[PDB]
Amino acid sequence: MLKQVEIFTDGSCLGNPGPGGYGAILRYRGREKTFSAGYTRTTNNRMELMAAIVALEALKEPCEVILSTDSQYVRQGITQWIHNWKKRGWKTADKKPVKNVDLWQRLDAALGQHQIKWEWVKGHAGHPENERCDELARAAAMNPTLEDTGYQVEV
């Protein structure tokens, strides 16, 4: 049994907005849990964030996690923006709510309990687990069954 929770995530979208989905693989306890769902109308950025949310939300106690994803948007958010957005109450410079604040806040809450180590992989050089996420995300977007409630053409 691994001594660290391993998480792999990916998200895909056919349009902007368009049908999209995510794939997440989680290695927790002695199991391998796979999560995937497609949404009728959403975006690539929101699916990549949803991948990470559902995997962390599965975590029932404070863990030491290693998250692997080739998503620029999650990376950008986590390394450059998230800190600053909390200091500014989740608003832009022109004082509006940040884009996808709904998901970034959800993600923020989900990271809180954990000791997380981020692994940013390049698309063409991920582990066998990242490729399966991609494949899952792509298949989910082809048969979408959920509604992305928080999506807005708007804010």
Side-chain angles (χ1 to χ4, degrees), residues 69-101:
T69 184
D70 70 340
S71 164
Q72 180 192 207
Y73 182 88
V74 168
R75 182 194 192 198
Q76 254 186 295
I78 293 297
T79 61
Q80 281 152 8
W81 315 329
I82 254 233
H83 192 77
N84 296 318
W85 285 336
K86 274 149 83 73
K87 284 280 209 217
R88 293 194 305 196
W90 293 104
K91 284 163 207 326
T92 61
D94 69 1
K95 293 293 162 186
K96 286 162 88 27
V98 302
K99 184 158 58 24
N100 302 321
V101 51

mmCIF file of all heavy atoms in Angstrom, residues 69-101:
data_model
loop_
_atom_site.group_PDB
_atom_site.id
_atom_site.type_symbol
_atom_site.label_atom_id
_atom_site.label_comp_id
_atom_site.label_asym_id
_atom_site.label_seq_id
_atom_site.Cartn_x
_atom_site.Cartn_y
_atom_site.Cartn_z
ATOM 1 N N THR A 69 -1.091 16.572 -12.979
ATOM 2 C CA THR A 69 -1.970 17.098 -14.042
ATOM 3 C C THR A 69 -1.117 17.951 -14.996
ATOM 4 O O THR A 69 -0.188 18.577 -14.481
ATOM 5 C CB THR A 69 -3.136 18.028 -13.487
ATOM 6 O OG1 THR A 69 -3.976 18.387 -14.653
ATOM 7 C CG2 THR A 69 -2.646 19.309 -12.816
ATOM 8 N N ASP A 70 -1.509 17.959 -16.248
ATOM 9 C CA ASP A 70 -0.806 18.773 -17.266
ATOM 10 C C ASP A 70 -1.610 20.045 -17.563
ATOM 11 O O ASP A 70 -1.340 20.697 -18.592
ATOM 12 C CB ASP A 70 -0.622 17.926 -18.533
ATOM 13 C CG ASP A 70 -1.899 17.647 -19.267
ATOM 14 O OD1 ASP A 70 -3.025 17.748 -18.715
ATOM 15 O OD2 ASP A 70 -1.846 17.319 -20.487
ATOM 16 N N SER A 71 -2.596 20.358 -16.733
ATOM 17 C CA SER A 71 -3.469 21.514 -16.887
ATOM 18 C C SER A 71 -2.827 22.837 -16.511
ATOM 19 O O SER A 71 -2.505 23.101 -15.341
ATOM 20 C CB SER A 71 -4.783 21.373 -16.070
ATOM 21 O OG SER A 71 -5.332 22.703 -16.013
ATOM 22 N N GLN A 72 -2.698 23.686 -17.521
ATOM 23 C CA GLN A 72 -2.077 25.012 -17.334
ATOM 24 C C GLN A 72 -2.903 25.918 -16.418
ATOM 25 O O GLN A 72 -2.332 26.707 -15.650
ATOM 26 C CB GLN A 72 -1.831 25.735 -18.674
ATOM 27 C CG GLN A 72 -1.196 27.107 -18.510
ATOM 28 C CD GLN A 72 -1.211 27.925 -19.771
ATOM 29 O OE1 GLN A 72 -0.371 28.804 -20.006
ATOM 30 N NE2 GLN A 72 -2.164 27.656 -20.667
ATOM 31 N N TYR A 73 -4.226 25.797 -16.570
ATOM 32 C CA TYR A 73 -5.160 26.627 -15.817
ATOM 33 C C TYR A 73 -5.141 26.313 -14.347
ATOM 34 O O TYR A 73 -5.152 27.260 -13.521
ATOM 35 C CB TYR A 73 -6.540 26.570 -16.444
ATOM 36 C CG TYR A 73 -7.615 27.396 -15.815
ATOM 37 C CD1 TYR A 73 -7.777 28.740 -16.256
ATOM 38 C CD2 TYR A 73 -8.513 26.914 -14.869
ATOM 39 C CE1 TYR A 73 -8.806 29.523 -15.736
ATOM 40 C CE2 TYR A 73 -9.541 27.700 -14.364
ATOM 41 C CZ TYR A 73 -9.682 29.009 -14.796
ATOM 42 O OH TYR A 73 -10.640 29.818 -14.275
ATOM 43 N N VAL A 74 -5.127 25.029 -13.988
ATOM 44 C CA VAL A 74 -5.059 24.711 -12.535
ATOM 45 C C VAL A 74 -3.698 25.218 -12.046
ATOM 46 O O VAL A 74 -3.605 25.861 -10.965
ATOM 47 C CB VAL A 74 -5.326 23.236 -12.238
ATOM 48 C CG1 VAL A 74 -4.962 22.868 -10.803
ATOM 49 C CG2 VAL A 74 -6.769 22.820 -12.489
ATOM 50 N N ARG A 75 -2.647 24.908 -12.803
ATOM 51 C CA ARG A 75 -1.282 25.327 -12.431
ATOM 52 C C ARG A 75 -1.152 26.839 -12.221
ATOM 53 O O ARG A 75 -0.656 27.252 -11.175
ATOM 54 C CB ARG A 75 -0.231 24.889 -13.421
ATOM 55 C CG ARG A 75 1.207 25.271 -13.052
ATOM 56 C CD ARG A 75 2.118 25.111 -14.216
ATOM 57 N NE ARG A 75 3.542 25.198 -13.836
ATOM 58 C CZ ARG A 75 4.450 25.438 -14.810
ATOM 59 N NH1 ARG A 75 4.070 25.724 -16.063
ATOM 60 N NH2 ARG A 75 5.753 25.279 -14.580
ATOM 61 N N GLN A 76 -1.573 27.632 -13.180
ATOM 62 C CA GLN A 76 -1.578 29.081 -13.187
ATOM 63 C C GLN A 76 -2.305 29.627 -11.959
ATOM 64 O O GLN A 76 -1.816 30.566 -11.320
ATOM 65 C CB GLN A 76 -2.299 29.647 -14.426
ATOM 66 C CG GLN A 76 -1.422 30.234 -15.475
ATOM 67 C CD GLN A 76 -2.170 30.912 -16.598
ATOM 68 O OE1 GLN A 76 -2.889 30.248 -17.356
ATOM 69 N NE2 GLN A 76 -2.022 32.233 -16.754
ATOM 70 N N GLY A 77 -3.475 29.067 -11.714
ATOM 71 C CA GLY A 77 -4.331 29.444 -10.568
ATOM 72 C C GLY A 77 -3.571 29.163 -9.277
ATOM 73 O O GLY A 77 -3.354 30.026 -8.423
ATOM 74 N N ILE A 78 -3.153 27.944 -9.068
ATOM 75 C CA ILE A 78 -2.416 27.509 -7.899
ATOM 76 C C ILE A 78 -1.077 28.219 -7.710
ATOM 77 O O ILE A 78 -0.674 28.375 -6.532
ATOM 78 C CB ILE A 78 -2.174 25.942 -7.938
ATOM 79 C CG1 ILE A 78 -3.526 25.184 -7.790
ATOM 80 C CG2 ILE A 78 -1.108 25.466 -6.900
ATOM 81 C CD1 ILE A 78 -4.265 25.423 -6.426
ATOM 82 N N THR A 79 -0.378 28.591 -8.763
ATOM 83 C CA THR A 79 0.956 29.181 -8.532
ATOM 84 C C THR A 79 1.027 30.704 -8.531
ATOM 85 O O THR A 79 1.950 31.267 -7.881
ATOM 86 C CB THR A 79 2.090 28.643 -9.495
ATOM 87 O OG1 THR A 79 1.712 28.983 -10.846
ATOM 88 C CG2 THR A 79 2.411 27.165 -9.335
ATOM 89 N N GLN A 80 0.121 31.311 -9.266
ATOM 90 C CA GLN A 80 0.117 32.754 -9.434
ATOM 91 C C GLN A 80 -1.067 33.532 -8.949
ATOM 92 O O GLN A 80 -0.881 34.723 -8.583
ATOM 93 C CB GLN A 80 0.233 33.009 -10.999
ATOM 94 C CG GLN A 80 1.695 32.820 -11.396
ATOM 95 C CD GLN A 80 1.929 32.376 -12.803
ATOM 96 O OE1 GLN A 80 1.048 32.293 -13.660
ATOM 97 N NE2 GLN A 80 3.210 32.081 -13.091
ATOM 98 N N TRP A 81 -2.256 32.962 -8.974
ATOM 99 C CA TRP A 81 -3.459 33.732 -8.630
ATOM 100 C C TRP A 81 -4.144 33.521 -7.310
ATOM 101 O O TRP A 81 -4.539 34.516 -6.669
ATOM 102 C CB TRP A 81 -4.466 33.523 -9.776
ATOM 103 C CG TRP A 81 -3.959 33.615 -11.156
ATOM 104 C CD1 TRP A 81 -2.932 34.362 -11.670
ATOM 105 C CD2 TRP A 81 -4.522 32.905 -12.277
ATOM 106 N NE1 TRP A 81 -2.793 34.178 -13.009
ATOM 107 C CE2 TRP A 81 -3.769 33.280 -13.413
ATOM 108 C CE3 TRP A 81 -5.560 31.988 -12.422
ATOM 109 C CZ2 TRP A 81 -4.061 32.738 -14.666
ATOM 110 C CZ3 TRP A 81 -5.850 31.449 -13.665
ATOM 111 C CH2 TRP A 81 -5.103 31.827 -14.774
ATOM 112 N N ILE A 82 -4.407 32.289 -6.953
ATOM 113 C CA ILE A 82 -5.122 31.896 -5.744
ATOM 114 C C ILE A 82 -4.758 32.666 -4.487
ATOM 115 O O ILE A 82 -5.668 33.015 -3.699
ATOM 116 C CB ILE A 82 -5.015 30.331 -5.539
ATOM 117 C CG1 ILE A 82 -6.385 29.745 -5.909
ATOM 118 C CG2 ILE A 82 -4.537 29.949 -4.114
ATOM 119 C CD1 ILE A 82 -7.031 28.834 -4.825
ATOM 120 N N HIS A 83 -3.498 32.876 -4.260
ATOM 121 C CA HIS A 83 -3.006 33.600 -3.096
ATOM 122 C C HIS A 83 -3.603 35.022 -3.058
ATOM 123 O O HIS A 83 -4.186 35.464 -2.059
ATOM 124 C CB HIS A 83 -1.443 33.684 -3.035
ATOM 125 C CG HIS A 83 -0.999 34.178 -1.689
ATOM 126 N ND1 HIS A 83 -0.970 33.387 -0.561
ATOM 127 C CD2 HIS A 83 -0.629 35.432 -1.315
ATOM 128 C CE1 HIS A 83 -0.569 34.149 0.459
ATOM 129 N NE2 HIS A 83 -0.330 35.379 0.023
ATOM 130 N N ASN A 84 -3.411 35.698 -4.186
ATOM 131 C CA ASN A 84 -3.816 37.064 -4.414
ATOM 132 C C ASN A 84 -5.332 37.243 -4.382
ATOM 133 O O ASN A 84 -5.796 38.318 -3.958
ATOM 134 C CB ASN A 84 -3.191 37.655 -5.700
ATOM 135 C CG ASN A 84 -1.683 37.746 -5.633
ATOM 136 O OD1 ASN A 84 -1.107 38.130 -4.581
ATOM 137 N ND2 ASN A 84 -0.992 37.387 -6.723
ATOM 138 N N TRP A 85 -6.044 36.275 -4.895
ATOM 139 C CA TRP A 85 -7.518 36.327 -4.941
ATOM 140 C C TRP A 85 -8.103 36.245 -3.533
ATOM 141 O O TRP A 85 -9.197 36.779 -3.272
ATOM 142 C CB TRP A 85 -8.083 35.187 -5.782
ATOM 143 C CG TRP A 85 -7.943 35.333 -7.258
ATOM 144 C CD1 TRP A 85 -7.794 36.449 -7.993
ATOM 145 C CD2 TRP A 85 -7.992 34.235 -8.181
ATOM 146 N NE1 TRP A 85 -7.740 36.138 -9.333
ATOM 147 C CE2 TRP A 85 -7.880 34.796 -9.488
ATOM 148 C CE3 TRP A 85 -8.124 32.852 -8.031
ATOM 149 C CZ2 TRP A 85 -7.846 33.999 -10.640
ATOM 150 C CZ3 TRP A 85 -8.084 32.086 -9.174
ATOM 151 C CH2 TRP A 85 -7.970 32.637 -10.464
ATOM 152 N N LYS A 86 -7.421 35.502 -2.682
ATOM 153 C CA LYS A 86 -7.942 35.374 -1.289
ATOM 154 C C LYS A 86 -7.758 36.733 -0.615
ATOM 155 O O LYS A 86 -8.688 37.246 0.005
ATOM 156 C CB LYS A 86 -7.309 34.266 -0.514
ATOM 157 C CG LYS A 86 -7.950 32.880 -0.698
ATOM 158 C CD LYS A 86 -6.858 31.820 -0.535
ATOM 159 C CE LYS A 86 -6.627 31.530 0.921
ATOM 160 N NZ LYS A 86 -7.794 30.744 1.423
ATOM 161 N N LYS A 87 -6.576 37.315 -0.779
ATOM 162 C CA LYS A 87 -6.298 38.663 -0.219
ATOM 163 C C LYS A 87 -7.267 39.734 -0.721
ATOM 164 O O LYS A 87 -7.482 40.718 0.016
ATOM 165 C CB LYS A 87 -4.906 39.152 -0.639
ATOM 166 C CG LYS A 87 -3.784 38.468 0.145
ATOM 167 C CD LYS A 87 -3.594 39.090 1.514
ATOM 168 C CE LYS A 87 -2.145 38.947 1.990
ATOM 169 N NZ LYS A 87 -2.217 38.697 3.469
ATOM 170 N N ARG A 88 -7.799 39.615 -1.907
ATOM 171 C CA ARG A 88 -8.701 40.556 -2.504
ATOM 172 C C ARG A 88 -10.154 40.097 -2.456
ATOM 173 O O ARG A 88 -10.963 40.581 -3.275
ATOM 174 C CB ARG A 88 -8.359 40.860 -3.979
ATOM 175 C CG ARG A 88 -7.043 41.596 -4.169
ATOM 176 C CD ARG A 88 -6.850 42.174 -5.506
ATOM 177 N NE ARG A 88 -6.970 41.233 -6.599
ATOM 178 C CZ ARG A 88 -6.529 41.511 -7.842
ATOM 179 N NH1 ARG A 88 -5.940 42.684 -8.047
ATOM 180 N NH2 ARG A 88 -6.671 40.660 -8.868
ATOM 181 N N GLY A 89 -10.455 39.175 -1.583
ATOM 182 C CA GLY A 89 -11.838 38.648 -1.492
ATOM 183 C C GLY A 89 -12.371 38.073 -2.784
ATOM 184 O O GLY A 89 -13.566 38.255 -3.139
ATOM 185 N N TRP A 90 -11.550 37.393 -3.602
ATOM 186 C CA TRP A 90 -12.103 36.784 -4.808
ATOM 187 C C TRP A 90 -12.695 37.696 -5.852
ATOM 188 O O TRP A 90 -13.602 37.269 -6.600
ATOM 189 C CB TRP A 90 -13.169 35.698 -4.333
ATOM 190 C CG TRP A 90 -12.505 34.560 -3.633
ATOM 191 C CD1 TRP A 90 -12.479 34.333 -2.281
ATOM 192 C CD2 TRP A 90 -11.716 33.513 -4.215
ATOM 193 N NE1 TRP A 90 -11.760 33.196 -2.001
ATOM 194 C CE2 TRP A 90 -11.280 32.681 -3.162
ATOM 195 C CE3 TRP A 90 -11.401 33.186 -5.536
ATOM 196 C CZ2 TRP A 90 -10.478 31.553 -3.352
ATOM 197 C CZ3 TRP A 90 -10.589 32.080 -5.740
ATOM 198 C CH2 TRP A 90 -10.150 31.279 -4.679
ATOM 199 N N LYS A 91 -12.102 38.866 -6.011
ATOM 200 C CA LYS A 91 -12.478 39.861 -7.030
ATOM 201 C C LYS A 91 -11.262 40.257 -7.884
ATOM 202 O O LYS A 91 -10.108 40.161 -7.506
ATOM 203 C CB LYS A 91 -13.007 41.152 -6.420
ATOM 204 C CG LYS A 91 -14.430 41.127 -5.872
ATOM 205 C CD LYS A 91 -14.599 42.332 -4.962
ATOM 206 C CE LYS A 91 -15.645 42.117 -3.889
ATOM 207 N NZ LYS A 91 -16.733 41.251 -4.457
ATOM 208 N N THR A 92 -11.595 40.724 -9.061
ATOM 209 C CA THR A 92 -10.649 41.236 -10.056
ATOM 210 C C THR A 92 -10.254 42.644 -9.613
ATOM 211 O O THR A 92 -10.669 43.114 -8.519
ATOM 212 C CB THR A 92 -11.372 41.256 -11.461
ATOM 213 O OG1 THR A 92 -12.511 42.176 -11.274
ATOM 214 C CG2 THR A 92 -11.924 39.872 -11.829
ATOM 215 N N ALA A 93 -9.409 43.238 -10.419
ATOM 216 C CA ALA A 93 -8.903 44.614 -10.179
ATOM 217 C C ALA A 93 -10.037 45.610 -10.399
ATOM 218 O O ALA A 93 -10.088 46.650 -9.703
ATOM 219 C CB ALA A 93 -7.724 44.853 -11.070
ATOM 220 N N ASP A 94 -10.974 45.276 -11.272
ATOM 221 C CA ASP A 94 -12.110 46.190 -11.581
ATOM 222 C C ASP A 94 -13.313 45.869 -10.712
ATOM 223 O O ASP A 94 -14.496 46.279 -10.909
ATOM 224 C CB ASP A 94 -12.269 46.290 -13.071
ATOM 225 C CG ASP A 94 -12.751 45.050 -13.794
ATOM 226 O OD1 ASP A 94 -13.018 44.015 -13.112
ATOM 227 O OD2 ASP A 94 -12.907 45.049 -15.042
ATOM 228 N N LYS A 95 -13.013 45.117 -9.662
ATOM 229 C CA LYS A 95 -13.907 44.708 -8.613
ATOM 230 C C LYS A 95 -15.018 43.750 -8.922
ATOM 231 O O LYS A 95 -16.054 43.765 -8.197
ATOM 232 C CB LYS A 95 -14.508 45.900 -7.818
ATOM 233 C CG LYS A 95 -13.433 46.613 -7.013
ATOM 234 C CD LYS A 95 -12.815 45.846 -5.874
ATOM 235 C CE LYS A 95 -11.487 46.465 -5.438
ATOM 236 N NZ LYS A 95 -10.861 45.584 -4.409
ATOM 237 N N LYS A 96 -14.840 42.894 -9.913
ATOM 238 C CA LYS A 96 -15.930 41.899 -10.166
ATOM 239 C C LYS A 96 -15.448 40.571 -9.602
ATOM 240 O O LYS A 96 -14.248 40.445 -9.242
ATOM 241 C CB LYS A 96 -16.260 41.925 -11.658
ATOM 242 C CG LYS A 96 -17.052 43.198 -12.028
ATOM 243 C CD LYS A 96 -17.085 43.551 -13.461
ATOM 244 C CE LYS A 96 -18.113 43.022 -14.405
ATOM 245 N NZ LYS A 96 -19.433 42.652 -13.812
ATOM 246 N N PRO A 97 -16.371 39.592 -9.489
ATOM 247 C CA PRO A 97 -15.996 38.260 -8.990
ATOM 248 C C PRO A 97 -15.069 37.652 -10.031
ATOM 249 O O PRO A 97 -15.199 37.906 -11.250
ATOM 250 C CB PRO A 97 -17.289 37.496 -8.809
ATOM 251 C CG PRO A 97 -18.390 38.463 -9.064
ATOM 252 C CD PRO A 97 -17.780 39.625 -9.847
ATOM 253 N N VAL A 98 -14.126 36.884 -9.546
ATOM 254 C CA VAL A 98 -13.199 36.216 -10.514
ATOM 255 C C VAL A 98 -13.976 35.188 -11.334
ATOM 256 O O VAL A 98 -15.070 34.716 -11.017
ATOM 257 C CB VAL A 98 -11.986 35.677 -9.746
ATOM 258 C CG1 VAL A 98 -11.236 36.776 -8.994
ATOM 259 C CG2 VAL A 98 -12.429 34.604 -8.734
ATOM 260 N N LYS A 99 -13.400 34.893 -12.496
ATOM 261 C CA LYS A 99 -13.957 33.909 -13.433
ATOM 262 C C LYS A 99 -13.832 32.516 -12.757
ATOM 263 O O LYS A 99 -12.768 32.189 -12.182
ATOM 264 C CB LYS A 99 -13.268 33.920 -14.794
ATOM 265 C CG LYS A 99 -13.968 32.939 -15.751
ATOM 266 C CD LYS A 99 -13.704 33.261 -17.206
ATOM 267 C CE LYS A 99 -12.274 33.288 -17.638
ATOM 268 N NZ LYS A 99 -11.402 32.455 -16.744
ATOM 269 N N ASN A 100 -14.937 31.819 -12.756
ATOM 270 C CA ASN A 100 -15.141 30.503 -12.173
ATOM 271 C C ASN A 100 -14.931 30.532 -10.666
ATOM 272 O O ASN A 100 -14.435 29.530 -10.109
ATOM 273 C CB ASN A 100 -14.190 29.483 -12.810
ATOM 274 C CG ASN A 100 -14.358 29.394 -14.311
ATOM 275 O OD1 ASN A 100 -15.517 29.451 -14.763
ATOM 276 N ND2 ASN A 100 -13.261 29.195 -15.013
ATOM 277 N N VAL A 101 -15.264 31.637 -10.039
ATOM 278 C CA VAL A 101 -15.050 31.747 -8.579
ATOM 279 C C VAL A 101 -15.702 30.576 -7.870
ATOM 280 O O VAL A 101 -15.186 30.185 -6.787
ATOM 281 C CB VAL A 101 -15.578 33.105 -8.046
ATOM 282 C CG1 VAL A 101 -17.025 33.383 -8.486
ATOM 283 C CG2 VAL A 101 -15.479 33.168 -6.517
#
